[PDB]
């Protein structure tokens, strides 16, 4: 479970408000939030690696409680 | 204080309607209207024991005690007056019914209507006068659509078609009550009474076309 997939975001969000955002729950050890080079903008889906698995399963339970730009945020195991 | 000593002491009074009449009347009047139900039980026992002495005086003592113990009005007071009107329903004099309905007329709940209207139906025997007076006064006063309907049904059972057509015409006035019934129709019913007039009664071939028109 150490990693999660996160959908439905707005590009003003970046890797930092994800950092800050999910460490509110529990620390994101490895952050991945693609920067698209071609048009220089984000599609808004994320992958998160944690310290171990327990962090991330609690993360499955609590985690789908973040609303990014008035809008819904997908978090599921991976 | 405790009205129990007033009920037991009111039941312990000897002689005729004297100590219990004045002592029980002033005792219940000087107390709170709570035990008055037990005063009605003692009024039924005293009215049953005094039922063998004449007519009036026991009924006036029990009715005066029940009306005095009810203060101004109450829910059970017209019910007790309707019970005295039920025992007095068979009398032979109109004074018991006049004072009966007069005592039941203090308030206007749903009660006492079935006391008043069948009283005019029974008094309506052998004379049209009380049916027309109580029917015309009942339908033209207070408020109810169904009062004139029941009075019209009781008036239609007589030998006169006037009071029936008078109540059907008063309800046929509409004015501030077009659909005085919703689904209930007091017009088409009166038109059905006109169809009863279209029955083989008048063969003159005149009122038939006037009733159909």
């Amino acid at each position: 479970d150490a990693t999660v997939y996160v959908g439905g975001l707005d590009e003003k969000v970046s890797e930092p408000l994800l950092w800050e955002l999910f460490l509110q729950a529990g620390p994101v050890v490895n952050t991945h939030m693609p920067k698209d080079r071609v048009t220089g903008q984000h599609q808004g889906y994320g992958f998160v690696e944690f310290l171990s698995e327990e962090d991330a399963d609690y993360a499955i339970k609590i985690m789908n409680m973040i609303k990014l730009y008035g809008k819904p945020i997908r978090v599921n195991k991976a | 204080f405790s009205v129990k000593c007033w009920l037991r002491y009111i039941e312990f009074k000897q002689g005729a309607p004297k100590p219990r009449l004045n002592q029980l009347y002033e005792r219940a009047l000087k107390l709170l209207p709570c035990s008055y139900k037990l005063w009605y039980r003692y009024l039924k026992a005293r009215r049953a024991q005094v039922k063998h002495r004449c007519v009036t005086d026991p009924a006036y003592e029990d009715v005066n005690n029940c009306h005095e113990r009810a203060f101004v009005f109450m829910h059970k007071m017209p019910r007790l007056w309707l019970d005295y009107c039920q025992f007095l329903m068979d009398q032979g004099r109109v004074t018991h019914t006049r004072r009966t309905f007069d005592r039941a007329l203090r308030a206007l709940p749903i009660t006492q209507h079935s006391r008043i209207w069948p009283l005019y139906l029974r008094f309506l025997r052998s004379h049209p006068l009380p049916e027309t007076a109580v029917r015309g006064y009942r339908r033209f006063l207070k408020l109810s659509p169904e009062s004139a309907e029941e009075y019209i049904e009781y008036l239609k059972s007589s030998d006169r078609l006037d009071e029936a057509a008078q109540r059907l015409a008063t309800v046929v006035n509409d004015e501030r009550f077009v659909s005085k019934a919703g689904k209930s129709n007091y017009q088409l019913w009166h038109e059905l009474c006109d169809l009863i007039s279209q029955n083989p009664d008048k063969v003159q071939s005149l009122n038939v076309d006037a009733i159909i028109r």
Binding site: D1, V4, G8, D57, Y58, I60, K61, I62, M63, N64, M65, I66, K67, K71, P72, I73, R74, V75, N76, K77 | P109, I110, L143, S144, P145, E146, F177, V178, S179, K180, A181, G182, K183, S184
Partner: protein
């Protein structure tokens, strides 16, 4: 011979007149006792008529003679003698009630309807709605997707079935979905645990707010919920 002279029939009502309008001002004893009217599950809009009950019979008769051919809302109305739930609100409008028939999975959902463990569904939303697929909620204090918690800790043959949302095997929390078609590709992946018994029409009103990407077009809220017990 009958004593059913309490329920009055009101006709020629307006599109704005409802059980409330009739209560504070109906024909007979409508606003009093109880009132009946044509209410939908999603639309929840009265037609024009209805039935009002009166505490007594005399009061009802008097209401008819009066309200009869009366003037309401600039119109002439006629008067004459006549398992758990979720109440759904869509936008600012009540849509109606969904009733559901529901051991560990059923007990969790039951408790989340009653709030008997100190938290539950009341006031939460259906945050992901996909037409011809499903309506997902139970992210009570989340409003995302697979957010919430079970009563135990953190962790498809046709329409109108209840099934648990999850984030993989053995990850049930509080999130659930109501199916809007046969969704057999989810068999063996999500735990089905109940069915709609009344108010499939209200579920269709929720589905009407869906989009292909799941974003609700209007807020869909569980205004109230509980158990029949």
């Amino acid at each position: 011979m009958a004593t059913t002279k309490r329920v009055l029939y009101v006709g020629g009502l307006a599109e704005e007149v409802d059980d409330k309008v009739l209560h504070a001002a109906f024909i007979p004893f409508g606003d009093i006792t109880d009132i009946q009217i044509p209410l939908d599950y999603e639309t929840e809009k009265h037609r024009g008529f209805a039935f009002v009950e009166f505490e007594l019979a005399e009061d009802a008769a008097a209401a008819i003679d009066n309200m009869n051919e009366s003037e309401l809302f600039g119109r002439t109305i006629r008067v004459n003698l006549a398992q758990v739930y979720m109440d759904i609100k869509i936008g600012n409008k009540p849509a109606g009630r969904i009733q559901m028939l529901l051991p560990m999975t059923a007990e969790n959902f039951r408790c989340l309807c009653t709030h008997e463990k100190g938290f539950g569904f009341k006031g939460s939303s259906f945050h992901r709605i996909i037409p011809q697929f499903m309506c997902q909620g139970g992210d009570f204090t989340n409003h995302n997707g697979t957010g919430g918690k079970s009563i135990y800790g953190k962790k498809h043959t046709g329409p109108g079935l209840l099934s648990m949302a999850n984030s993989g095997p053995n990850t049930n929390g509080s999130q659930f979905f109501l199916t809007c078609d046969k969704t057999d590709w989810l068999d063996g992946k999500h735990v089905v645990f109940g069915e709609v018994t009344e108010g499939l029409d209200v579920l269709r009103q929720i589905e009407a707010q869906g989009s292909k990407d799941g974003k609700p077009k209007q807020k869909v809220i569980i205004a109230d919920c509980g158990e029949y017990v």
